């Protein structure tokens, strides 16, 4: 309650050089469905499953 939602994080099996459209659509739907999720503060973190690492 004392903390603000800074967005959401998700993992991806492939290294995407650009932004994902489905994740951006889910972030836009979460920003439109919740008034406390402002677009200037909420972000999307993508963890690309690198071989032996994580980007």
């Amino acid at each position: 309650k004392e903390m603000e939602p800074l967005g959401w994080i998700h993992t991806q099996p492939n290294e995407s050089p650009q932004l994902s459209p489905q994740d951006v659509t889910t972030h836009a739907k979460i920003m439109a469905d919740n008034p406390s999720w402002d677009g200037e503060k909420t972000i999307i973190i993508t963890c690309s499953f690198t071989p032996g690492s994580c980007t």
């Binding site: 008034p35 406390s36 402002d38 200037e40």
Partner: protein, 43 residues
């Protein structure tokens, strides 16, 4: 200060109720400011 001035027990209960009312008013003002900030960010 060096020598604090306490009050009566009913006066202490009234001071605690006044502090709770001031905290509730500050929380209501913070909620109004948050609603105004949300209305400014949405528009």
């Amino acid at each position: 200060e060096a020598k604090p001035k306490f009050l009566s027990k009913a006066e202490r209960e009234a001071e605690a109720l006044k502090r709770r009312q001031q905290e509730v008013e500050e929380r209501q003002r913070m909620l109004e400011e948050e609603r105004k900030k949300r209305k400014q960010f949405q528009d």
